[PDB]
Amino acid sequence: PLESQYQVGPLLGSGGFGSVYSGIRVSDNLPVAIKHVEKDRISDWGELPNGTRVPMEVVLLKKVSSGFSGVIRLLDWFERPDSFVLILERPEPVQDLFDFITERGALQEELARSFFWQVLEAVRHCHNCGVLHRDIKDENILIDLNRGELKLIDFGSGALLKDTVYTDFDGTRVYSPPEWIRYHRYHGRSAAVWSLGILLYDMVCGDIPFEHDEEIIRGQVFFRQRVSSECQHLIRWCLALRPSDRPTFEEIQNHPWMQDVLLPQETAEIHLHS
Numbered sequence: 001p002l003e004s005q006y007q008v009g010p011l012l013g014s015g016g017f018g019s020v021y022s023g024i025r026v027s028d029n030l031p032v033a034i035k036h037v038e039k040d041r042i043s044d045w046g047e048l049p050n051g052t053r054v055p056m057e058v059v060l061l062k063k064v065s066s067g068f069s070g071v072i073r074l075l076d077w078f079e080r081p082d083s084f085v086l087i088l089e090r091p092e093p094v095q096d097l098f099d100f101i102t103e104r105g106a107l108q109e110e111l112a113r114s115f116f117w118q119v120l121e122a123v124r125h126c127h128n129c130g131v132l133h134r135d136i137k138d139e140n141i142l143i144d145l146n147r148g149e150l151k152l153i154d155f156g157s158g159a160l161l162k163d164t165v166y167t168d169f170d171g172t173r174v175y176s177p178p179e180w181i182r183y184h185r186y187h188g189r190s191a192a193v194w195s196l197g198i199l200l201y202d203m204v205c206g207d208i209p210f211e212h213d214e215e216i217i218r219g220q221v222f223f224r225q226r227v228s229s230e231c232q233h234l235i236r237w238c239l240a241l242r243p244s245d246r247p248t249f250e251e252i253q254n255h256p257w258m259q260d261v262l263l264p265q266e267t268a269e270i271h272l273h274s
């Protein structure tokens with residue numbers, strides 16, 4: 001019943017999400033990640049089913065924790081005078097999609113298809129559980145390099161899912177949709193599909209398509225790499241300017257470009273030198 005049940009390792013990263021460390025649970029040498037969030041710096045707070053104030057990330061992680069390996073699982077959490085400490089699972093070996101794309105450039109379509117499909121399955125899982133991520137992007141995706149499995153992380157900018165309009169947003173601007181930029185209003189699903197469009201382009205071209213607000217609003221997509229027409233079609237669909245013109249998750253998964261996806265294990269054998 002303390003913090004010394006884990007042997008703390010090196011710092012993995014720090015940013016708007018706080019500070020995350022590599023760790024090992026001494027109880028059984030299980031690889032873990034240890035995230036510390038200062039209370040002053042917490043955006044949105046939630047409340048646990050049993051009445052007690054916690055960071056929204058904790059509520060959301062509990063709602064999605066299950067057998068599904070598509071989302072990083074919350075093993076435990078603690079409260080401190082001025083911070084919260086989350087204990088999360090940690091694949092080993094691992095690499096985040098942002099670094100993987102920095103090192104390999106534009107990913108081959110077969111690989112981007114496997115990864116994109118897995119992201120789709122995970123976002124669907126979150127939505128079934130009543131959770132909206134709101135910061136889907138390469139830096140918030142981990143690759144279990146041995147099994148070829150992607151895991152979604154960092155629900156700190158997330159919210160309970162609803163059908164009404166959202167007037168707040170604290171995720172990544174360049175992954176944010178035109179309707180946010182222009183009116184500070186979005187619906188959850190359509191906004192998610194837009195970020196998924198940004199993420200697919202990122203995967204197949206090696207960089208995000210838009211850097212400035214004027215480009216997001218204009219919505220014209222230029223391809224800087226060789227990309228098949230089907231893939232270009234799916235990306236442009238996801239990046240439709242009107243929210244209602246974007247595809248649903250079902251429409252994305254039944255799109256011609258998404259057929260014959262490789263299983264994660266096959267994916268690691270062919271593309272991850274596993």
Ligand SMILES: O=c1c(O)c(-c2ccc(O)c(O)c2)oc2cc(O)c(O)c(O)c12
Nearest residue numbers: 012017033088089090091094153154155
């Ligand atoms: O295992 C994790 C993990 O759970 C997380 C994680 C999990 C939940 C969060 O909210 C979050 O911000 C990060 O992050 C990282 C980041 C790394 O660079 C790495 O090598 C890792 O192994 C991990």
